[PDB]
Amino acid sequence: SHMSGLKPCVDWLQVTFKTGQDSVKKCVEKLEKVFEILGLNEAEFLPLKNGKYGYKQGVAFQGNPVLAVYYDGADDMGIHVEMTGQGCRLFELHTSINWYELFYRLVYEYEVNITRLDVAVDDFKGYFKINTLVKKLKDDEVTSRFKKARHIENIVIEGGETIGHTLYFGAPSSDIQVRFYEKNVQMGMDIDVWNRTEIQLRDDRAHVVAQIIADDVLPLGEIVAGLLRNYIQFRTRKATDKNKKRWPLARFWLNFLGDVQPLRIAKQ
Amino acid sequence: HMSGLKPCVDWLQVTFKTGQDSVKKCVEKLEKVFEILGLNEAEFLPLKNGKYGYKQGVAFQGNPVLAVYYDGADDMGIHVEMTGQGCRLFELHTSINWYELFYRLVYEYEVNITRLDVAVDDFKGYFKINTLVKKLKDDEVTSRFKKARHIENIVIEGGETIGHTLYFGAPSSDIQVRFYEKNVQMGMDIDVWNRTEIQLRDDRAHVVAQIIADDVLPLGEIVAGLLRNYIQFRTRKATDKNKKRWPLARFWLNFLGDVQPLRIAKQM
């Protein structure tokens, strides 16, 4: 492909429109309103076979469950929107608004719980190999606010080659998880370099980042880079000192974080 | 102090369909479901939330490991979910047994069995998971699967790798096999505890259910047969380069031979 550089994006979104709150912001109660808030044409939503998460019914954009709106749950469950990775791309292709506008509305105009937001960086240049990260972890060259990482690798049974590496930091249910993987391998695509770094945020953490996107002032890159820097330090072993806390941050990592900083969600 | 090999049923999910023109009886009431399970109606309490598109649920002694979901969209029926712990809980309190439950589900009532897991606990230690990993990477394995996933945990302070796990097949596909160190997974102070699990979905699950219900073959023979057929750990033979003519490894032949006669007892 002609894919190059680093590119940031929003990669998951789940929000719930609450009902019957005495709130300063507007409560949403109708599906039609939800479609409008998204900047998407009502006519394009179709019913789904099944609900999900305790909601008895759902609709989806062009019938596609990657971009779904669930409703008719137990008392006070409101309306729940779910936009997977693919759904965020689908949103982008058809919405009449901008990410910042969507988040403006969710943050400032309506009464919503933002339950999950994932932000990502695609790396088409190749600042590092995931396996280098794995190695650094196993060689005791990493510090972090997390206690453990999960390492997943695929093994092709005929031949025995290890082809794709994934690292997960934090529990999936907790309010911040970081993931690194080879997205070329994951997607079955024939591109030499495509690494993905993802931060998954839940509840309050997700709201704050939504607000920052809404206000549109700080580049998204700065939030991603600030969070990665703070949560995880890949370091270079220094023979002189045994205190890991005084090893310098590794060069590939400083370069990655420094080139991530200025990145902005594309506007149009 | 535990020893040997022990089989068990380790997950079950079924849906009672409504309004089928069927030779078998349609179930339409929760009370009937409790009776089919041989469990006391009085012991079921409401859950906070539904799940999977069902708006409401109850659970045995309030405990969601053994749950019954209902009030979903038209034609969704009633869904029972029994996790690992729920299968143990079922065993302790039911007035019937596994054979009778599967008899009822396969021959008496109109049900979709969506998932069934069967497991073997190994307290002797017929192999180490890491040996299996190594054999895979050394090109000493053939299988009907194309890939395995190897999952390991890495402790960030120190870099120690703990908790090796191997998965064969995708989690959505209709047969998956898993091997892991269950002593490590459960945080328990037992020297050797390996677990082998076969997860089956839809028709694959029904077939094994039907085998249990017919009560002609030991369960051990189905587990051992599936393992043998789907995965072959082999010993490298210097004379021949063709993997297909390497003999099966000894530990593996010993494991499968001792799994064969294992049974699900008639008393829980």
Author numbering:
A (entry chain D): -1 to 266
B (entry chain B): 0 to 267
Question: Which sentences from the paper describe this structure?
Answer:
In Gram-positive organisms, the smaller plasmids often replicate via a rolling circle mechanism, a process mediated by a multi-functional replication initiation protein (Rep) encoded on that plasmid. The Rep proteins possess two related catalytic activities, a type-I topoisomerase-like cleavage activity in which they form a nick in the (+) strand at the origin of replication to initiate DNA synthesis, and a religation activity to join the ends of the parental strand that is displaced during replication. Despite low overall sequence identity, there is a high degree of structural conservation between the catalytic domains of the Rep proteins from these Geobacillus stearothermophilus and Staphylococcus aureus plasmids. Structure-based sequence alignment reveals the conserved residues are almost exclusively located in the β-strands containing the Rep_trans motifs, and it is likely the crescent-shaped catalytic domain represents the canonical fold for the Rep_trans protein family.
In this report we describe the structure determination of the core domain of replication initiator protein of cryptic plasmid pSTK1 (25,26) from Geobacillus stearothermophilus (RepSTK1 residues 1–269 (27), hereafter referred to as RepSTK1). RepSTK1 formed crystals belonging to space-group P212121 with four molecules per asymmetric unit, arranged as two dimers. The structure was determined to a resolution of 2.3 Å by MIRAS phasing using mercury chloride and potassium chloroplatinate derivatives. Each subunit is crescent shaped, with a concave inner surface formed by a 10-stranded, antiparallel β-sheet the outer surface of which is decorated with eight α-helices. The subunits interact via interfaces at either end of the crescent to form a ring where the diameter of the central cavity is 20 Å. The model of RepSTK1, crystallized in the absence of divalent metal ions, contains a water molecule in the metal binding site. The interior cavity of the catalytic domains is also positively charged, when calculated with a divalent metal ion modelled into the active site. The DNA binding residues of RepSTK1 have not been identified, but two extended loops protrude from the surface of the protein (the top of the protein as shown in Figures 2A and 5C) replacing the separate DBD found in the staphylococcal proteins. The differing quaternary structures of the catalytic domains of the Rep proteins may represent functionally relevant conformations, since the active site lies on the inner surface of the β-sheet and the diameter of the central cavity of RepSTK1 would severely hinder access of the dsDNA substrate. Enabling RepSTK1 to undergo such a conformational change would require disruption of one of the interfaces stabilising the ring, with the smaller of the two interfaces needing significantly less energy to disrupt.
